[PDB]
From Swiss-Prot, chain A:
The gene is S. The cytoplasmic Cys-rich domain is palmitoylated. Palmitoylated spike proteins drive the formation of localized ordered cholesterol and sphingo-lipid-rich lipid nanodomains in the early Golgi, where viral budding occurs. This is Spike glycoprotein. It is found in: Virion membrane; Host endoplasmic reticulum-Golgi intermediate compartment membrane; Host cell membrane. Variant D614G has become the most prevalent circulating sequence in the global pandemic since April 2020. The mutation is associated with higher viral loads produced in cell culture and animal models. It would not change pathogenicity nor neutralization properties vs vaccination. May be prevalent because the mutation increases virus transmission in human population. Changing A7V: In strain: 19B/501Y. Main component of the anti-COVID vaccine Chadox1/AZD1222/AstraZeneca; in which the human tPA leader sequence is added in N-terminus to enhance protein secretion. Disulfide bonds join C16-C25. It comes from the Viruses. Belongs to the betacoronaviruses spike protein family. The lineage of its organism: Viruses, Riboviria, Orthornavirae, Pisuviricota, Pisoniviricetes. Contains sequence and structural motifs very similar to those of a bacterial superantigen and can directly bind and activate T-cell receptors. Activation of a broad T-cell repertoire may be involved in the hyperinflammatory syndrome in acute COVID disease. Glycans are attached at N11, T30.
Amino acid sequence: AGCLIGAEYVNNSYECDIPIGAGICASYQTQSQSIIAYT
Amino acid sequence: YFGGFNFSQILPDPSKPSKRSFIEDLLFNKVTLADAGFIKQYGDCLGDI
Ligand SMILES: *[C@@H]1O[C@H](CO)[C@@H](O)[C@H](O)[C@H]1NC(C)=O
């Protein structure tokens, strides 16, 4: 759904916090807190 | 084995990468979709042919 700048991808899976696009969600997590994007 | 009932057509098969059934394959091939913005078609729109 475009491309994301500022959020790092992680190889994990949680429930959806912020819906981005086709199976991608984003969250504010500690894994120094930052913004991560996952499936 | 489910008591003689054949569920081989609606259960998924690991042969194809998209884990869909036979009837789901027929239902997906029957409807002609007009895209959903998945491949980011602005790059092909820039290359006008
Ligand atoms: C019915 O079941 C048999 C074995 O359980 C299988 O070989 C066969 O392919 C099934 N029928 C269909 C139409 O898939």
